Symmetry: C2
Subunit: 112 residues, 2 copies
């Protein structure tokens, strides 16, 4: 590394990749306001909060978790152009507090 690397690091640091926990919450923060799918949950996080990234291993662990707990449920969806149903996600219910705070925790984490 050269000295232009060290400086070009304090202004443009690499983003923080969410932990499994950050994912489970970040997802709920998204699905409580809308329906979404895998790859979309990763770009949405990035474009709207560039100091962060979400891999695929983590996003999936998080998703699995939110399924065996019936918090989130998935389904298929058609997309004009390619005969391939996309797996969507939504909140498993209308009123849910066990997931209200989880998503509420993300919001806090973003604060400041």
């Amino acid at each position: 590394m050269d000295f232009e690397d060290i400086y070009r690091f304090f202004q443009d640091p690499p983003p923080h990749y969410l932990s499994k926990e950050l994912a489970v919450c970040y997802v709920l923060a998204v699905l409580r306001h809308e329906d979404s799918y895998g790859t979309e949950l990763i770009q949405h996080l990035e474009t709207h909060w560039p100091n962060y990234r979400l891999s695929d291993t983590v996003l999936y662990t998080a998703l699995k978790f939110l399924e065996d707990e019936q918090i989130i449920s998935g389904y298929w969806k058609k997309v004009e152009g390619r005969g391939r149903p996309r797996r969507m996600y939504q909140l498993a219910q209308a009123n849910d507090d066990r997931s209200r705070d989880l998503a509420q925790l993300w919001e806090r984490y973003l604060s400041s």
Copy 2:
């Protein structure tokens, strides 16, 4: 992969592991006031900054860089009761500005 986990991450968040770029400035901030050595730099960081770890790998990648650029020099000092000597690192020259500037960067980092 359970809820206690997600409720444990926020209480006990994993510490941050400095990068070479970070490690350098940190090691530089320390080597300004007083002289020091390898195991001490990381022992002093960890104890006074519980959310920061400095791997031996990175720390040494840092130290090399600093010597390869001739900003830090090293001598050999005996340790009372330990037949085995200890390598000590010190600001190379007298009045240096490349160090000062780089130390400040760390000094600020804390905040962001």
